Design an enzyme around this catalytic site. Structure first.
Site, PDB file in Angstrom:
ATOM      1  N   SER A  11      19.033  24.566  45.804  1.00  0.00           N
ATOM      2  CA  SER A  11      19.495  25.555  45.422  1.00  0.00           C
ATOM      3  C   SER A  11      18.701  27.018  46.506  1.00  0.00           C
ATOM      4  CB  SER A  11      20.611  26.110  43.923  1.00  0.00           C
ATOM      5  OG  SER A  11      20.360  27.938  43.828  1.00  0.00           O
TER       6      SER A  11
HETATM    7  N1  LIG Z   1      25.231  35.504  45.924  1.00  0.00           N
HETATM    8  C1  LIG Z   1      24.441  34.401  44.729  1.00  0.00           C
HETATM    9  C2  LIG Z   1      25.050  32.945  45.497  1.00  0.00           C
HETATM   10  C3  LIG Z   1      25.023  32.412  44.077  1.00  0.00           C
HETATM   11  C4  LIG Z   1      25.618  30.866  44.323  1.00  0.00           C
HETATM   12  O1  LIG Z   1      26.837  30.474  45.649  1.00  0.00           O
HETATM   13  N2  LIG Z   1      25.010  29.379  43.921  1.00  0.00           N
HETATM   14  C5  LIG Z   1      25.192  28.288  44.195  1.00  0.00           C
HETATM   15  C6  LIG Z   1      24.413  27.004  44.521  1.00  0.00           C
HETATM   16  S1  LIG Z   1      23.562  27.299  45.857  1.00  0.00           S
HETATM   17  C7  LIG Z   1      26.293  27.479  43.175  1.00  0.00           C
HETATM   18  O2  LIG Z   1      25.970  27.477  41.656  1.00  0.00           O
HETATM   19  N3  LIG Z   1      27.474  27.144  43.726  1.00  0.00           N
HETATM   20  C8  LIG Z   1      28.923  26.713  42.083  1.00  0.00           C
HETATM   21  C9  LIG Z   1      29.893  27.261  42.277  1.00  0.00           C
HETATM   22  O3  LIG Z   1      30.333  28.266  42.974  1.00  0.00           O
HETATM   23  O4  LIG Z   1      30.804  27.130  41.422  1.00  0.00           O
HETATM   24  C10 LIG Z   1      23.593  34.297  44.172  1.00  0.00           C
HETATM   25  O5  LIG Z   1      22.213  34.011  45.158  1.00  0.00           O
HETATM   26  O6  LIG Z   1      22.743  34.146  43.615  1.00  0.00           O
END
Ligand SMILES: N[C@@H](CCC(=O)N[C@@H](CS)C(=O)NCC(=O)O)C(=O)O
Ligand SMILES: N[C@@H](CCC(=O)N[C@@H](CS)C(=O)NCC(=O)O)C(=O)O
Lengths: 221, 218
Positions: B10
């Site tokens: 990630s």
């Molecule tokens: N703005 C957030 C974005 C976090 C994010 O989108 N993480 C993704 C992984 S790259 C995630 O957890 N996706 C799971 C989901 O959206 O349910 C950050 O920078 O922490």
């Protein structure tokens, strides 16, 4: 004293976030409109202020501050009579920063993924997956609203940022009140602010109407 | 101690990994497998209703969101404010850059990769690839100095590199069009902790996307 200048467009959600914040702080902005259709954001002078060529941009006595979230933090930090709108405390600030990045990374990003192609690339139909991306954002917001406001039980700049985009996109992608009662309750709180309609409501309605109008013009071509 | 709920592939998790290394902090990494929906459990929804990684647990203090986490870590643990200024004007430049990362770089990366990883997608639509190309140009123009903001390393560099290093393995980033991005990448790659904290995961996630794209096509 040199008055604050905002390079802006009232139909723009991030610009309206700053307008709300300025009203909350008792500041008067000198608004300079930037017409994106005639590329006023792509002049050498504008690109010098902001290489990413977006509005809003603040000019405070010669100091150039780009980006709505950064501008709001800057204004509260410099001109706030207290830190109510943006906490200086480590943990509360982190909650606010998380919310502000949710607005840029989810709410506004997905709003743009729907609206930009209509407004700048002759789009006449909103793809189903992009509409669903926005529906998913509504649910994420609904679950974020555990308290009366985006963060905690009092108004902050996270509210200004989130409402500026939600109030816009809900006029394009239907936001089911039976599915998202907390979002509507929160919108009602913000609409009770005496400066809400002028600083935000008017432009949110205007931008949605413009998007829908352009989409139809494009379809009917 | 410091616990990070995380996934090494990630990008936002790797931004935090970079930041922790720069601060001399040791993170206890707890893996959350998004592919098997480990982020959708009630306990995880409790820490983060938006169900995303990374999430930091600092002796019971829960901090969500990579940019917020990095600001929190620098504020609390930095020997000085080098990585994230407390000064009004520089802080505003940093905040603008961090929101560029979330709103442009990462958002557009996700618009390409998520459908393939989570929705059985076997294609990258031309318009989404172009959206990323436009992001590269925006970044190139942002680099008016050696780093994203100014001439020294900050958390804006960690945030931007974590996503750029990932998406460039999926959407080609022409070195002839973007010389400043490559010069800046080299500065980050020269950090002794770069490959462990970021480079490896950036390579892994690009391979993952390309692999899944081809599997889905079958
Ligand atoms: N703005 C957030 C974005 C976090 C994010 O989108 N993480 C993704 C992984 S790259 C995630 O957890 N996706 C799971 C989901 O959206 O349910 C950050 O920078 O922490
Ligand atoms: N994260 C930025 C987003 C700014 C933004 O995308 N503004 C749009 C208007 S809504 C714009 O100026 N677009 C011109 C362009 O992208 O070239 C902010 O909050 O200020």
């Amino acid at each position: 004293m040199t008055k604050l200048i905002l390079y802006t467009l009232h139909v723009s959600p991030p610009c309206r976030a700053v307008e709300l914040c300025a009203k909350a702080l008792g500041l008067e902005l000198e608004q300079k409109t930037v017409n994106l259709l005639t590329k006023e954001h792509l002049t050498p002078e504008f690109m010098k202020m902001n290489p990413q060529h977006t509005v809003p941009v603040l000019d405070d006595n010669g100091t150039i501050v780009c980006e709505s979230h950064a501008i709001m933090i800057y204004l509260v930090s410099k001109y706030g009579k207290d830190d109510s709108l943006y906490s200086k405390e480590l943990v509360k600030q982190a909650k606010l920063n998380a919310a502000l990045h949710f607005e840029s990374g989810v709410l506004f990003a997905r709003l743009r993924f729907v609206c930009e192609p209509i407004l700048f690339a002759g789009g006449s139909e909103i793809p189903a997956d992009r509409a669903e991306y926005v529906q998913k954002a509504y649910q994420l917001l609904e679950d974020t609203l555990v308290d009366d406001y985006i963060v905690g039980n009092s108004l902050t700049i996270a509210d200004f940022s989130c409402v500026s985009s939600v109030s816009s996109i809900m006029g394009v992608i239907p936001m089911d009140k039976e599915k998202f009662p907390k979002i509507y309750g929160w919108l009602d709180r913000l609409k009770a602010l005496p400066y809400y309609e002028a600083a935000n409501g008017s432009g949110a309605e205007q931008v949605a109407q413009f998007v829908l109008s352009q989409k139809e013009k494009n379809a009917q071509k």
